[model samples]
Target: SHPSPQAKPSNPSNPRVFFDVDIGGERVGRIVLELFADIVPKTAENFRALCTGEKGIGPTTGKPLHFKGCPFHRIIKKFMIQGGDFSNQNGTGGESIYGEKFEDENFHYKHDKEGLLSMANAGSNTNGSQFFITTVPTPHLDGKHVVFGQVIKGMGVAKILENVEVKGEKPAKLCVIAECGELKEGDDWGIFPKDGSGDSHPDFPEDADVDLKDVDKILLISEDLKNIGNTFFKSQNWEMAIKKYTKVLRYVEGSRAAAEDADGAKLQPVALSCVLNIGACKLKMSDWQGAVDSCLEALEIDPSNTKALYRRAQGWQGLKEYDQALADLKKAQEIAPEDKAIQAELLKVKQKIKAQKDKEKAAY
Candidate 1:
């Protein structure tokens, strides 16, 4: 299956989580989790141990890797289903490989989309080996749980379990992880470092100093997000591109409100660019009114911004509002008389208006 263009791709070098599900002692399907070790190192480590039998013991002692043959104890339709209770085969008796509860590492990642694997906890800092995979986005659970990985494959298997015959959300036929471990034998999965020696997947430098209290840090993160949005835009991933740019716009607005600069000369241009890019993304999505609104937002920042006027004119033309389109094109032409693009668009708008008038006369 193709990886989502919006999401961060899983690292080929990093270990992958693989699980085999069974019903009535027959294998049904498999699921793969792309762990985010950089963001939630402790949680990922604990999960990996359970998968490899390095951590917790099974109900009957063998090796570790306790998740194998464990039943999915809890099922919530359209929300998520959970397992990894290796001790009791029920929800209550599981602990991290470390042998106790750990502090919450609720980091930057969000539970805004589906297939996210988050640590199941009773409250804050209670994360252990028990985990749940979201079948659908549960944004309300954001910050309440720590997201450690995403299910990159086997969503169909997850769906089967979600819709499995149940008694009060308990499956009549228990969904069992027949085999669970770091990807290795059956699926071309690789072996993870037994010593856990690799550096935490560092998206940012470990030594870099950042002040959350400083507003400049907001700008830095927002700018980085905008760059990611640009990458999506180049790939023609309109939906994801729009999501990123919208985030940048949100940050820009917050920054503008708190900006101490009297003139806003330092940040206004950056904000305007975000608005214009949002307009561009909207145009690509064929959302004419949304495009127009976005362009108008940039124009409010700089009334004479030629690009905003030109794009707004395009949006008006899309809506068959030829008069409005013509007005914007004329204003843009006035601002940059040598702009051949504006001249060309003005001609088109005029021709459209004339055609509309002729059609009206014909109907009359």
Candidate 2:
């Protein structure tokens, strides 16, 4: 194994840059990369200028030589993701600051580990605007490609891009550089995700600086998020409430495999509640399939959970699948025979079924 890119603090001389990536129109997250300006200044400056779009326009292509609103045309799981074709928006186009293409800058850094940023080329000395982020150690690319930078933060965003459903290396959805710019020394990376409710935490747990092994801290954050979700739920902001509960699920999901009888099980209770709350919120929004999925997830944590069973039954009813709804309600009623709501839903579904049969008979 070679030294990790983040083995030590990034050098003061290296320039940092950021990409505000959006996959399929919705913003995924921000990725902060440290360009190896000290080692490959010419190559680094080319990229930095391209990022800032300080250059006016490409004469040959007649396009603003910029990284903004560009698509990640190619993606290969476990290998890398390719993008930065502003002109073609595929792998074919993109002119460098110099001209059509430039020579391979010195390959000072090896593609020894994940997150190393390297220039993608067609053949020898074909360094254009296009580049790729390594998801794994790509030793074969060391001699051929110039590794000018490495992702300092937002590996998760890269992972999401890498994992996007691809058909022959093309992402099924529109993966774009929604925004991009150079971060002068001491500039903020904008690492945190935003919501109107003021969530200070990173949307993805992978982006958080905290150690996930600290289960206590994870639970505290989950609790805070769950209460925030409840606040949104109270205000009938079902969409935002679902978002908060979903974030809670992300934090608590990892520790759910811990033994049921042990303190390791601390996360399971939180996850169950969050997922059920998400199910409830989905139901309010009339997203029957989404509600069904949430309840199914909650049931994965506790199969006999009355709330999940009842909620899933509601989802089934909304989908107009009375048989499935009746079955779920019956099972829920059996689990908690004294619950009035579950009993009432069972009767309501039975009436709906009878009404459907009578209507069918009348039609005949």
Candidate 3:
């Protein structure tokens, strides 16, 4: 609403967004979405279509679908959720609605499946704009309801509503959606649930391609990396620091930013940051090879990571590898053309490389 301040490239047909609200107290919650572009494009389009189009859903009400009274209707524990009645603002009633319905259900689709999104209707052909997200697989309703989409993110938020303290028919707390939009490639949305496993650190198997949607999981991992590395570095625990840094890289590989089509995920920034820091730790410990490895890893995420450039150049200089030092410094200068220090460093390394080459030529 009012044109989101943090606007990213996305079609109105698909949307991902976060909302802030008060439940006993003000709490900020995030909701990442995967739009059913191929499923109910009309419904998806109609939802987002109202956000900023003619007679658009206003900012105050957050543009929730105002289908007379299609408010949340059914609640089942750890199983399924049903609502979307429009007419009786109090959750019952539906008649002449203003939306059109389309039939494009793929034959292979199944309902009563966990995370499945199905439309709620009075009869088989009474499909309107009301839909529900199922939390558990209910094979009983498989072929009955129109299963269009599923909740790929934030099932926890849906679970939280099961216990809304309703007194006198008024909910003590209500689900207030901030905004919703479709996520584009490279766009980060969704939250990762905490894992109880102690082995939850990031690690990619050798030569394995990464999945980037797990970036949220990496947020927890980065903190662990910082803690483990700090302990080793502060206490001179070189072995432990190496272990920790290695773990961080693995988790980074699983992030949404690492997915095959990662243009929508901006993971390079985090990868660059982690690599630079890890390389710095290696340099601090005088592990020239380790420093090179870390810096090279960071550069893989972004060839222009200046910090990685600086650390790799320094590492090569320390090893007296003048040619390699010159290469990194030159790249660093190119990436940050206005950085005087990089320019100066590039000049120094280049001169050193030239001198080394001259010395070899003279000896021959």
Candidate 4:
């Protein structure tokens, strides 16, 4: 549930900012980012200024620069989500509050989990308005990206952004930052305390934290296994591909059990996708029944899925069930009328049925 807009800041000192994000002018959710002002002073300041519209004129538009209407131009699942390219709305444009590039604070914080807010830049000392929030641990980004904030709330929103349909990294829908401002009272205590005197609170509840870590570990392993399965599939190693895909499915099951709340919905798609991969592998192994079963499982989650329909039709054709194969192909064709693959499958099925009819007539 979303908090009402009337909610005011409780702690005015280190106010938390709420970046309400929307897609197609509909509110998706909000991201509450708590700045680490005491640690990365300049980085925090620059970000805060942008959030508050305190920054001067835009580098390109000549109007006041702010994050109010900016969109996250780049999103990568299991990696990070980025935006703040106010200069051009694309990932290529943005500028620091100083009007030029500035030196990196080179903070000692690690990008070891989700919700880590860090600066986005080409190289060192090029910090600007562009920043990213880690959706997973990015160890390679350590010491390079200046960690300035953390998502204290609305991680679900961030996950949605991570899973958004995109043209490469750019989101297909407009994920606009509708508004930005500080929260008077929030859990704003910095994770990496400057003097070791501040509140060192964890990002989530203890039990919730454990569950998420477990799910993340399982997902990481599943991803590796999936990649291995893909390699085997590419090499035509049917047995190895089946083994790898099956292993990933097992891992995905464990991940689903460990996931909590919104995580379940997020993990469901990944699990279904893996099942579809398994179906593909089974088809190559000539295990028609196995392929059929796998595709059926995927269809339970996405009843109208074209891929599932096509794969199931392949399984039916392998079993010489011409009627079932034709039905599935017709459904797939209706869903994707212009698809050459579906058209080819439909033609093949029709010819088989006609040949059977001709044989029966000759015998009669």
Preferred candidate (TM-score higher): 1 or 3? 1
Error in Å for residue 249 of model 4 = 23
RMSD value for candidate 1: 13.3
Candidates in order, TM-scores: namely 0.48, 0.86, 0.40, 0.51
Which parts of model 2 are misplaced by more than 4 Å?
A: 1-13, 59-62, 165-168, 254-263, 319-323, 355-363
Could you list the CA RMSD of all candidates, in the order they appear? 13.3, 3.1, 19.0, 15.3
State the displacement of the C-alpha of residue 53, model 2, in Å, after optimal TM-score superposition.
2.3
What digit string (tens of lDDT, one per residue) describes model 1 on residues 1-364? 1222244335554457778888666665677787777666777888877888864453333335468878998888899999887777678767776655788875567777778888998998887678999988787777788888887666666887888888887888968998877874346532211122231111121112333234566567667767877888898988767766775665555555656655334556667877898899888888999999999999999999999999998999889888889899899999999999999989888888888899888953
Q: Please provide, for model 2 over 1-364, each residue's C-alpha lDDT reduced to its tens digit, 9 standing for 90 to 100.
A: 2343564235877888989999888888898888888788989999999899999799878999899999999999999999989999888899899999999977677788899889999889999899999999999987789988888888888999999998999999999999999887677668877456777777777667666666788889889889988999999999889888998887765544432346557788888888998999899889999999999999999999999999998999899999999999999988899999998989999999999899888953
Off by over 4 Å in 4: 1-13, 59-61, 186-364
**Which candidate leads in TM-score?**
2
The most accurate candidate by lDDT is 2
Pairs of residues at least 3 apart in sequence or in different chains that clash in candidate 2: none
Q: What overall lDDT, based on C-alpha atoms, would model 1 receive against the true structure?
A: 0.73
Residue clash pairs of candidate 1? 53-64, 53-65, 183-189
